[PDB]
Design a protein around this ligand. Structure first.
Ligand code: K
Ligand code: K
Ligand code: K
Ligand code: K
Ligand code: K
Ligand code: K
Ligand code: K
Ligand code: MG
Ligand code: MG
Ligand code: MG
Ligand code: MG
Ligand code: MG
Ligand code: MG
Ligand code: MG
Ligand code: MG
Ligand code: MG
Ligand code: MG
Ligand code: MG
Ligand code: MG
Ligand code: MG
Ligand code: MG
Ligand code: MG
Ligand code: MG
Ligand code: MG
Ligand code: MG
Ligand code: MG
Ligand code: MG
Ligand code: MG
Ligand code: MG
Ligand code: MG
Ligand code: MG
Ligand code: MG
Ligand code: MG
Ligand code: MG
Ligand code: MG
Ligand code: MG
Ligand code: MG
Ligand code: MG
Ligand code: MG
Ligand code: MG
Ligand code: MG
Ligand code: MG
Ligand code: MG
Ligand code: MG
Ligand code: MG
Ligand code: MG
Ligand code: MG
Ligand code: MG
Ligand code: MG
Ligand code: MG
Ligand code: MG
Ligand code: MG
Lengths: 273, 44, 91
RNA sequence: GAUAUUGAAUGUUGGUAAUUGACCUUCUAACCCGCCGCCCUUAUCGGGCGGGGAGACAGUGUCAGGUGGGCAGUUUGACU
RNA sequence: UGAGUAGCGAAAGAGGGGUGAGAAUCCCCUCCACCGAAUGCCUAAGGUUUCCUGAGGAAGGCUCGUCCGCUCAGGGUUAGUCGGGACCUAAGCCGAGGCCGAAAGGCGUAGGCGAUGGACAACAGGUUGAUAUUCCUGUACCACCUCCUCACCAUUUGAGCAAUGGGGGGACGCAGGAGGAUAGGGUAAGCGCGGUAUUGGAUAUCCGCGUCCAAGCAGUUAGGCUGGGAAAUAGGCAAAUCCGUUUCCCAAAGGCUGAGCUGUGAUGGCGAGCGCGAAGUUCCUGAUUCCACACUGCCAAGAAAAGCCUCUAGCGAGGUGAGAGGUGCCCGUACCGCAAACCGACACAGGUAGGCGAGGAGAGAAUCCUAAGGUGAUCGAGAGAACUCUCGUUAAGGAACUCGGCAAAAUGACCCCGUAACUUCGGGAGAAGGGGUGCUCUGUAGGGUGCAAGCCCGAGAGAGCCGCAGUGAAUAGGCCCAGGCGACUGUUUAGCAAAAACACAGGUCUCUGCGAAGCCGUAAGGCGAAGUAUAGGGGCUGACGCCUGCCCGGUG
RNA sequence: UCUACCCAUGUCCAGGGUGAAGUUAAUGGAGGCCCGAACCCACGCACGUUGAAAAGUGCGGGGAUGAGGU
């Protein structure tokens, strides 16, 4: 549920939060953590290549099992946990052999739920099968693009995709965006919608809360100078004053499609979003 | 008022020192020029 | 190395004279010499029993004779305490 | 877009006397893989080997057209 | 030349004595004054001998100079334990092969380097002109070694050692509150030592000063977390008697840790005071420190690696434990360090991380005056004009001033009463507006601490007293009505603009199916993201509320 | 070595007030919350303008648990 704060100050006015009712423990699994330093949107040259990224809270990386490749061994859901590195919650799985792993927490998973990977697994929320084994109409998440690589698509909080049909070697899947696409049938997908569906409703409330999440301010092009941005300059406020709205680097940025026109995956994409 | 020169021997040596100069072609040209001019001090 | 390369010369000061009453002998030593080498050198040369060697480095002093500035040599000074039951060194 | 890297088949439709074109589909063996396993090897680099995916496409070279204040060099008269 | 002109850089000195060729300026003494959450003490960076002693007075010192951070001599820095290295890793940097690139080179794997972090054994007192967890005294601890001593275990299921491997651990945020404790404080009581005053009074509930103590070792403790045992085991690159998991069996124990306290250390040391040396207890108060990120709460979800422990894999004829004897390197250590020694060209009203930071009254690190301790400021002497500056006061009037109440004045603390429009129901609000506030006696009610005397804290009254005035000084909101703009806290033109500009939460459009788009780079390699459409980039708008019409010809 | 932003790792912030959620009027202790030192800033005025200072000083001023300072 979304908790709404009372307006005890102007900062707090309209601010909302997760109640974190799903989260069953505060402490992560020490063995599945890795270090994760901030980059500030700087690349290997030390240069800022993405704007508006920097600062925010320190975070440890939780190693998530996107592959879901322990076929046959049953796994008990031990915890549902906050992960700072992603919108979804994660679930610690205790496998019967004593291996521990994190997965993405699906909607309506519970502590003590048994889960199973592989072609022989049941079609139940938390399980992970090859798409050849998943029946048509099944809501899935954490979809592989290449066999064995790990789930890449449909991982964010509340997101879901649907298996539409099997074309032998490929399976049709409606992705979360609404795009319909051929996925190799050997690729795995996890059963269910991703949990933490309310995430999108959160009203961040104040500037400082965006800063905690590592988002530095966006300055509009219109209030820069001509040497900085195509929209810069003009005496007083100015309209766009150009044929198209423009990016900082002088490309059209409203409607202009940027997917590469010769793309190898074009054949796999059946219906665009 | 905080002025521009804030001395620090580590930073002096790391930025301007002999090993820094020797670590690049252009730094080696600095040393070659200063030797050619006949400087007492080649580097920090 | 030779023992007599380690010990350069005795320090003859009021301080060093006061130390000799306490059975401590001050030497200028080779700048590279560690205090174990100094201990071994004193025992070899003088035939005494060393309790401990304390050692210190002195920087070169800036100096002038007219216009020409320059530095004195850096020095390594060893204060060699002999044991209670030991022969004294003859300076 | 042409052409090189660039191969093999099956169709179909040109043009010359059975060869050579054009295009469609298929193939695998070049090429590619920011996919998996194994080894070099204590290695999220690289390379090798074996799967898988893709495939004569892509990528890259040469040539060509379009777009292109993103950037560059400049011009923007004189009388008064 | 200007000109013997401007200036001589925030500040309290006065006299006596001394030295000397010479003294406002150097030394000594006395009293006075200044700082005292510092102008004290410690210690970074930085400086590099400026430190100490003796001698000096050309220059430097805004004057002088016998003096000095200056000149000349000579001297001074002592470590197994402090800080750094012979330990560990972060960001980043370097980078065998490697990838990429006209050349130069760029990138990057293994592997390293790299503290601002992790780890890690010594304390108290004394001493020099100048060093001191470094020297000395006393009492310790850590690692390693074996000519030795003693005990115990064992020579192929055979002690023991044990990985560069596995596992555990290390290992982490922010806020809040309550405990426990200790520094520190009060001198309350007791104790000790000294004093009894000549200015009216006082063996007085009189005056002054002092009133302790380490690491280590042994014991103990507020407590803190932790559930443990036994089998079996698709996992932990091999193996595991370890870890993980499961199932049974007990729910108090066991672990792991603990500030501090007590004994000892100490037949010692320190100690008012006069080399000698008294008392050296208790009570009260009490942290911003420690127990301890322990607990509780919260979302923004809070390094790594080693030391350490354990496990096997290995290694093994001698081991293990205790004693005794022994070994323990290099670098720094002077001095300045809110400053005349560093950064500002200066002996410059500026800047300079961190630790400690006492008392009275106090909520306090505010404020004023003081303590410990430090200091009197590097031109002076007069005169007391204009004018300028910084202050204080001002008849009557009270914004008439002025672009504008600019400046100044006023308000100011605590307690009690009372408090509007409007509102997003939080606010507005310390709204506004009133009243009280000292001292004495009753003398407290009550509370904390203690076994109790006692010691702190302490309303609310009643009756009195004094002044022009009682938060009698210093320090402590002026307030209200209405309107434009921007919702808000933030941000900005270092050095003429702080704003209505930027940002912002929210809104919307758009791109982006992941080798994503976008971006940096010739490329390799990267950022995006160890993210995956509830995500990421770009444009515009800018809380919230009500809303956001018409036009697709032109341009995109 | 100034400054802009970022990265890793430390550290600093006297005191007082208000009283969100939650819990059972009390309890609780939220906040780019309030008042206010240190610290950071630089709104007004004066002075300074061959300065004590190539941006300061004095008296007032803003922030002061945060989008914080260092
Ligand atoms: K808000
Ligand atoms: K903006
Ligand atoms: K403009
Ligand atoms: K003060
Ligand atoms: K002198
Ligand atoms: K020293
Ligand atoms: K602005
Ligand atoms: Mg952005
Ligand atoms: Mg502008
Ligand atoms: Mg432009
Ligand atoms: Mg424009
Ligand atoms: Mg206009
Ligand atoms: Mg030493
Ligand atoms: Mg142009
Ligand atoms: Mg030209
Ligand atoms: Mg003309
Ligand atoms: Mg004309
Ligand atoms: Mg005259
Ligand atoms: Mg004149
Ligand atoms: Mg005159
Ligand atoms: Mg004058
Ligand atoms: Mg002066
Ligand atoms: Mg005073
Ligand atoms: Mg001196
Ligand atoms: Mg003079
Ligand atoms: Mg150390
Ligand atoms: Mg490199
Ligand atoms: Mg090489
Ligand atoms: Mg360090
Ligand atoms: Mg230590
Ligand atoms: Mg000293
Ligand atoms: Mg010292
Ligand atoms: Mg100064
Ligand atoms: Mg008090
Ligand atoms: Mg005080
Ligand atoms: Mg008047
Ligand atoms: Mg009057
Ligand atoms: Mg008027
Ligand atoms: Mg007028
Ligand atoms: Mg005013
Ligand atoms: Mg504003
Ligand atoms: Mg300005
Ligand atoms: Mg201004
Ligand atoms: Mg690329
Ligand atoms: Mg990446
Ligand atoms: Mg706008
Ligand atoms: Mg419109
Ligand atoms: Mg049209
Ligand atoms: Mg605030
Ligand atoms: Mg400061
Ligand atoms: Mg500023
Ligand atoms: Mg304030």
């Amino acid at each position: 549920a979304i908790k709404k704060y009372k307006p005890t100050s102007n900062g707090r006015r309209g601010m909302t939060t997760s109640d974190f009712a799903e989260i069953t423990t505060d402490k992560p699994e020490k063995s599945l953590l890795a270090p994760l330093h901030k980059k500030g949107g700087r690349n290997n040259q030390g240069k800022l290549t993405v704007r508006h990224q920097g600062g925010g809270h320190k975070r440890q990386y939780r190693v998530i099992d996107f592959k879901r490749d322990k076929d046959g061994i049953p796994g008990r859901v031990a915890t549902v946990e906050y992960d700072p590195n992603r919108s979804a919650n994660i679930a610690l799985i205790n496998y019967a052999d004593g291996e521990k792993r994190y997965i993405l927490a699906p909607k309506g998973i519970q502590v003590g739920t048994e889960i199973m990977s592989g072609p022989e697994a049941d079609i139940k929320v938390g399980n992970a099968l090859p798409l050849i084994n998943i029946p048509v109409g099944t809501v899935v998440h954490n979809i592989e693009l290449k066999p064995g690589k790990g789930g890449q698509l449909v991982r964010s909080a509340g997101t879901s995709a649907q298996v539409l049909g099997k074309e032998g070697k490929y399976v049709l899947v409606r992705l979360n965006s609404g795009e319909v696409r051929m996925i190799l049938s050997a690729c795995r997908a996890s059963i269910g919608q991703v949990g933490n569906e309310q995430h999108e409703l959160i009203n961040i409330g104040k500037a400082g809360r965006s800063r905690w999440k590592g988002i530095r301010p966006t300055v509009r092009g219109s209030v820069m100078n001509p040497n900085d941005h195509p929209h810069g300059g003009g005496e007083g406020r100015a309209p766009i004053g150009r044929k198209s709205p423009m990016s900082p680097w002088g490309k059209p940025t409203l409607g202009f499609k940027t997917r590469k026109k010769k793309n190898k995956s074009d054949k796999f994409i059946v219906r665009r979003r | 008022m905080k002025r521009t020169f804030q001395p620090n021997n580590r930073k002096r040596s790391k930025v301007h020192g002999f090993r820094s100069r020797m670590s690049s072609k252009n730094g080696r040209l600095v040393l070659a020029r200063r030797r050619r001019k006949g400087r007492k001090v080649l580097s920090a | 190395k030779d023992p007599r390369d380690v010990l350069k010369r005795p320090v003859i000061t009021e301080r060093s004279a006061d130390l000799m009453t306490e059975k401590k002998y001050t030497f200028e030593v080779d700048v590279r010499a560690n205090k174990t080498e100094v201990k071994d050198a004193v025992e070899s040369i003088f035939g005494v029993k060393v309790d401990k060697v304390n050692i210190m480095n002195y920087k070169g002093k800036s100096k002038r004779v007219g216009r020409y500035t320059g530095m004195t040599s850096r020095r390594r000074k060893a204060i060699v305490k002999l044991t209670a039951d030991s022969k004294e060194i003859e300076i």
